[PDB]
A paper describes a structure:
As a zinc ion–dependent enzyme, CDA participates in the pyrimidine salvage pathway by converting cytidine and deoxycytidine into uridine and deoxyuridine. Bacteria extensively exhibit two forms of CDA: a long form and a short one. The former harbors two tandem CDA domains typically structured in a dimer assembly (homodimeric CDA or D-CDA), while the latter possesses a single catalytic domain arranged in a tetramer assembly (termed homotetrameric CDA or T-CDA). The CDA derived from E. faecium (EfCDA) belongs to the T-CDA form. EfCDA showed the ability to convert gemcitabine to its metabolite 2′,2′-difluorodeoxyuridine.
The investigation of the interaction between EfCDA and gemcitabine involved the co-crystallization of EfCDA and gemcitabine. Due to the similar molecular structure shared by gemcitabine and dFdU, distinguishing between these two molecules based solely on the electron density map pattern posed a challenge. However, considering the catalytic activity of EfCDA, it was anticipated that gemcitabine would be rapidly converted to dFdU. As a result, the molecule identified in the co-crystallized crystals was determined to be dFdU. The dFdU molecule, situated within a pocket delineated by molecules A, C, and D, exhibited interaction interface areas measuring 176.4 Å2, 70.8 Å2, and 61.0 Å2, respectively, suggesting that these individual molecules all contribute to the binding of dFdU. Additionally, the O4 of the dFdU molecule, working in unison with C55, C88, and C91, demonstrated chelation with Zn2+. Hydrogen bond formation was observed between E57 and O4 and N3 of dFdU. The ribose ring of dFdU participates in the creation of multiple hydrogen bond interactions, wherein the O5′ forms hydrogen bonds with the amide group of A48 and F50, respectively, and the O3′ interacts with the side chains of N44 and E46 via hydrogen bonds. Notably, the two fluorine atoms of dFdU establish hydrogen bonds with the hydroxyl group of S49 and the amide nitrogen of G51 via a water molecule. Furthermore, the dFdU molecules were discovered to interact with F26, V28, T53, F127, and L132 through hydrophobic interactions.
Numbering used by the authors:
A (entry chain A), B (entry chain A): 0 to 132
C (entry chain B), D (entry chain B): 2 to 132
Amino acid sequence: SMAELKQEWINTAIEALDKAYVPYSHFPVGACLVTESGKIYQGINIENASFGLTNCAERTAFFKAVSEGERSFTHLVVAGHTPDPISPCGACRQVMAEFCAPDMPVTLVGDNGVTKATTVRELLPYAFTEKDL
Amino acid sequence: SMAELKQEWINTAIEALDKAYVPYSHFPVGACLVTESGKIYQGINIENASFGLTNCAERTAFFKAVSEGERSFTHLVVAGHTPDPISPCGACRQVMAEFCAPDMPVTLVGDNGVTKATTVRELLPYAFTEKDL
Amino acid sequence: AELKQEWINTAIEALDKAYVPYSHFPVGACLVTESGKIYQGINIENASFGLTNCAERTAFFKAVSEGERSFTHLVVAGHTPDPISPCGACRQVMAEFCAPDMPVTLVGDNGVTKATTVRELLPYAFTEKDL
Amino acid sequence: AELKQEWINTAIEALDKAYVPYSHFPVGACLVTESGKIYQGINIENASFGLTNCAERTAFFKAVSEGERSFTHLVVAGHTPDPISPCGACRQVMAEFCAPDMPVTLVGDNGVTKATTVRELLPYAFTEKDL
Ligand SMILES: O=c1ccn([C@@H]2O[C@H](CO)[C@@H](O)C2(F)F)c(=O)[nH]1
Ligand SMILES: O=c1ccn([C@@H]2O[C@H](CO)[C@@H](O)C2(F)F)c(=O)[nH]1
Ligand SMILES: O=c1ccn([C@@H]2O[C@H](CO)[C@@H](O)C2(F)F)c(=O)[nH]1
Ligand SMILES: O=c1ccn([C@@H]2O[C@H](CO)[C@@H](O)C2(F)F)c(=O)[nH]1
Ligand SMILES: [Zn+2]
Ligand SMILES: [Zn+2]
Ligand SMILES: [Zn+2]
Ligand SMILES: [Zn+2]
């Protein structure tokens, strides 16, 4: 079922918290990006001594997937060690809008099983696109 | 009046379109960031041969203002040569959320006088903050 | 410095796989670990140009996400008359994860190449030591 | 290379002005134009670390937004035992707007300094030539 699959994706994103490279913030974030073909891509945040070159977990998952030729995504899970479900930052929301349909579901996870259901469009309303370039 | 001030800010953002450094996209964006003290900061997008080091007009305005000690913002105008009012990208929305109140008004401008009224919260719902760091 | 044709092939083959709808300027990377495992990178652009990710960083983000921490070589290729140059942001990510002396091979069109290292590309590198 | 105390003062004074609630690691910059006009930079962090902007880039974004295109010197200061090092991203922005030979002065605590140039900090610099 869709709910049982979502729990395996949640597990993938939560396990990513243990793989994060965060020696400066000590704030791990995990992601599970799911393709239309069923393949999952796990993302971690990856920091840099120069903070601005840090890459978020959500973007790591997209860059992994897109590098393998993936262009059709059906779900994204993001997890954090947070009392409420973790929130993707605006930069990640913009990468999500580049590759995903507006109505693609996004599940946000925090500690102690808390979750929030949303979509790409709800996280980034009136999204900037390539339309006018 | 608030509406007459908003038109001077709109003019500032539109004039910024002529100052943009966009030799690669040729897509200028202008910004007018207004402080509680009445001071305005004009932003332009500034590209780099390595595209990822490009800085948006909205962020240029914030970096100018914050570098002068500004921490209290009351309005942001963003303008583009676009048929509908220009949309700030997610990265800019995240910088807006760092420094602005959720309900701070944002005016988006396109060509031929088209405008859209919104706020920091509406552009970036459920915003990620420093709360859990 | 050792240079395997597989590594060159990995970086050049990536040129056809890049996500570059805005620049049409593909960049390819092959990042090699101590075990010999290879990670291919492509540049991945965004309608907001400043969210673009370079091929070199894509390769590092892939490898680091799989737990790799020991790198022995990086090949970078472009469709360029001289060997392609990694940008400064990529050089800083390379310095995060690689030894100063780790070899780097830069490739352009028609077989032009240039051999260098992490330290030569980023002298007097900024590190975390004073944070 | 000419070095004015005003420029050093501008970069060091910026250390007290930085927006660094996450690292508490301030960086200051003084960017000088041909006309002698100076632009002060600070690093400006973000709760999402990857949206942080460096002091060097803040100075360039300020100057370029005011129409400046001719730069003659960059001073960068940190509270560091050795002169602070610009990160690779900053070096790439410097290469966008500065001559290869434009002088750069790096400053640390207790008056330690190091003189360099844009080209020495970013050898074999990537440019727009093949786009
Ligand atoms: O959307 C987001 C927002 C933040 N993070 C990570 O939080 C830490 C502190 O910023 C950094 O390592 C990070 F990369 F920004 C994500 O992974 N995704
Ligand atoms: O929010 C935004 C989104 C895009 N832009 C600019 O559009 C051009 C094409 O991406 C680039 O120069 C730019 F910087 F990204 C902004 O200025 N602000
Ligand atoms: O070091 C580098 C420098 C540039 N590129 C790519 O060139 C295009 C134009 O900037 C963008 O798509 C890109 F990502 F920045 C790399 O992949 N690596
Ligand atoms: O070149 C550089 C390298 C780092 N910094 C600043 O150091 C802190 C920790 O990375 C961040 O606040 C910062 F912005 F990246 C600069 O200002 N310039
Ligand atoms: Zn993010
Ligand atoms: Zn933006
Ligand atoms: Zn790069
Ligand atoms: Zn920097």
